[PDB]
Amino acid sequence: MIIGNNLHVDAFYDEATSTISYLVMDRETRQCALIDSVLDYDPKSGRTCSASADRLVERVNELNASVRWVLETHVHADHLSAAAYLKEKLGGHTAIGAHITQVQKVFGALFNAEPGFARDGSQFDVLLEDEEGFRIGNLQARALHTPGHTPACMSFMIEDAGEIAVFVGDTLFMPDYGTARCDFPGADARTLYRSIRRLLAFPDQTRLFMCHDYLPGGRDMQYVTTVAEQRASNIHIHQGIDEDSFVAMREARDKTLEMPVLILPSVQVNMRSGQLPPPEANGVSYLKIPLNKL
């Protein structure tokens, strides 16, 4: 897609985790950003693979690009982040919400992390705050704090000409599927409602890019929608739904949800900015799986 004049957006879909990754480039400077990259991982054998990550490396080189930002909307609990691998091969700066510290505090205790594990977000280059601006070449971008799914959820808006594109993360899905879950630690259905209403306050022709697409059909994969479409036909939080009705709906639905397959391996890796836990005496890195907790 090309929004406005110089906003270039490439979408990448991982069927295994239903995760949509993004390559966002300024066409004027050929300088780009990578959002929510997927690190392939098999829970059975405990083996990683940069198969999907290399799809981004090829796309960058094909466009003669230059990575400036490696972004993450939130601490993913459904897949492993490939932010560290991409920074090691394409360079740039990693960035995540400032409230990563709250997440690191909780799961730092759940996994009984080694004393060397930082709870200040030292693993991430830049800690973004609400309404904070940052530059992708000539493209003016802003980081928006939109909690609900997690306490540290951020949304990235990028402007070119008069048109706006917002990368919302795990807040809104396609209008036919609804919204994200709020059964994770720190999550809140009432907070999510407010973050979305604030998101839908944007101009109605604002393009919204999704983090997941579970395909309610039937239909193929879709990643882009508009504010006007969401306000009119979202099955969970369209314009007719007030705060109280959403919360009762959202909370009742979360109780009927199963845990993500890779939630325990994902968080302990994504809280380290995509770094594997440090090797033990035998030089082997291990993922700690808490028993009968969570």
Subset of 4-23 contacting Fe ion (CB under 5 A): none
CA distance 202 to 159: 12
CA distance 1 to 236: 27
CA distance 18 to 34: 17
Q: Which does 284 bind (CB under 5 to 8 A by kind): a second copy, Fe ion, none?
A: a second copy
CB of 281 to a second copy, least distance (A): 7
Nearest residue (CB) to a second copy, 29 versus 285 = 285
Q: Is 261 annotated in some ligand binding site? A: yes
Q: Residue 72, interface with Fe ion (CB under 5 A)? A: no
Q: Is 57 annotated in some ligand binding site? A: no
| Radius of gyration of the chain measured on its C-alpha atoms | 18
Strand order in the sheet with 207-210: 132-136, 139-145, 154-160, 163-169, 207-210, 224-226
Cα angle 124, 14, 198 (rounded to 5 degrees) comes to: 60
Q: Which does 170 bind (CB under 5 to 8 A by kind): a second copy, Fe ion, none?
A: Fe ion
Residues found in the chain: 294
Q: Which residues 6+ apart lie within 8 Å of 115 measured at CB?
A: none
Binding residues for a second copy, rule: CB under 8 A, are 42-48, 109, 111-112, 258-261, 263-265, 276, 280-282, 284-294
Q: Is 74 annotated in some ligand binding site? A: yes
Q: Which does 1 bind (CB under 5 to 8 A by kind): Fe ion, a second copy, none?
A: none
CB of 223 to a second copy, least distance (A): 26
CB of 286 to a second copy, least distance (A): 4
CB of 108 to a second copy, least distance (A): 11
Question: Which one of residues 26, 40, 170, 213 is an interface residue with Fe ion (CB under 5 A)?
Answer: 170
CB of 275 to Fe ion, least distance (A): 19
Cα angle 129, 65, 56 (rounded to 5 degrees) comes to: 75
CA 151 and chain centroid, separation: 13
Nearest residue (CB) to Fe ion, 26 versus 124 = 124
Q: Which does 47 bind (CB under 5 to 8 A by kind): Fe ion, a second copy, none?
A: a second copy
CA distance 83 to 220: 27
CB of 49 to a second copy, least distance (A): 9
Nearest residue (CB) to Fe ion, 65 versus 168 = 168
Nearest residue (CB) to Fe ion, 235 versus 263 = 263
Nearest residue (CB) to a second copy, 41 versus 223 = 41
Q: Tell me the number of residues near Fe ion by CB under 5 A.
A: 1
Q: Is 93 annotated in some ligand binding site? A: no
Q: Are 155 and 166 in contact (CB under 8 A)?
A: yes
Joined tokens for residue 89: 């091969």
Nearest residue (CB) to a second copy, 217 versus 284 = 284
CA distance 33 to 55: 14
Q: What is the DSSP string of 262-281?
A: THHHHHHHHTTTTPPPPP-T
Q: Which does 121 bind (CB under 5 to 8 A by kind): Fe ion, a second copy, none?
A: none
SS3 284: coil
CA distance 66 to 25: 9
Feature table: binding site for glutathione: 78, 181, 214, 250, 253, 261
